[PDB]
Design a binder for this molecule. Structure first.
Ligand SMILES: [Pb+2]
Lengths: 90, 121
């Protein structure tokens, strides 16, 4: 399934699996959002890249940058401002 | 204020169909559910999607956070699902039981209602 999936379809999957569907209690939290992005990053590097060898190996900052550029509504759905997220990770 | 909800549902459903092409619609969602068996915890844990398929079969997908191995099972009859203690118990014919642990106990009664109303004739 992840074999022959585009980078775009991978980021969609990771958003829905880790970011999009947070319980109300875990929203408005920079550190929780960061934890989910980190979990998504591990899943990507560990499971997805093992299935599709053409997918780029990425560091945490660049991975986050590509998930958020892929969908700016991730900020709205998790109720976290990009400004606050950036100040947390500097 | 429904735009962001429409889009989220559309991204969710597109991902589901990527894994399972016969999925037609999302009925509802529970944020965080773990699957149990005998009661022993399985490797499967993540977001729970109650789904309708092409043939109008009601079922659910958990997009697993622990591995790329997901769970997709059908609810054949509303009587197949009971609330027993802290589990949403899901039974298939000859005593094949899966136990659903909802983080957030509110989702037990909530998803139970949704399942019954989905299978209501
Ligand atoms: Pb933390």
């Amino acid at each position: 399934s992840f074999t022959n999936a585009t980078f775009s379809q991978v980021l969609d999957d990771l958003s829905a699996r880790f970011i999009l569907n947070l319980p109300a209690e875990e929203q408005s939290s920079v550190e929780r959002l960061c934890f989910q992005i980190e979990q998504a990053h591990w899943f990507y590097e560990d499971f997805i890249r093992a299935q599709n060898d053409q997918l780029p190996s990425l560091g945490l900052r660049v991975f986050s940058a590509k998930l958020f550029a892929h969908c700016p509504l991730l900020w709205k759905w998790s109720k976290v401002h990009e400004e606050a997220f950036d100040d947390f990770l500097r | 204020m429904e735009d962001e909800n429409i889009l989220r549902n559309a991204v969710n459903l597109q991902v589901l169909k990527f894994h399972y092409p016969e999925i037609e619609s999302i009925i509802d969602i529970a944020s965080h559910v773990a699957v149990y068996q005998f009661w022993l915890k399985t490797s499967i844990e993540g977001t729970f999607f109650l789904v309708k398929d092409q043939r109008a079969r009601v079922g659910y997908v958990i997009l697993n956070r622990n591995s790329p191995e997901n769970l997709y099972l059908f609810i054949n009859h509303p009587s197949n699902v009971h609330l027993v203690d802290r589990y949403l118990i899901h039974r298939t014919e000859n005593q094949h039981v899966v136990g659903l642990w909802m983080f957030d106990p509110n989702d037990m009664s909530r998803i139970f209602n949704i399942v019954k109303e989905s299978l209501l004739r």
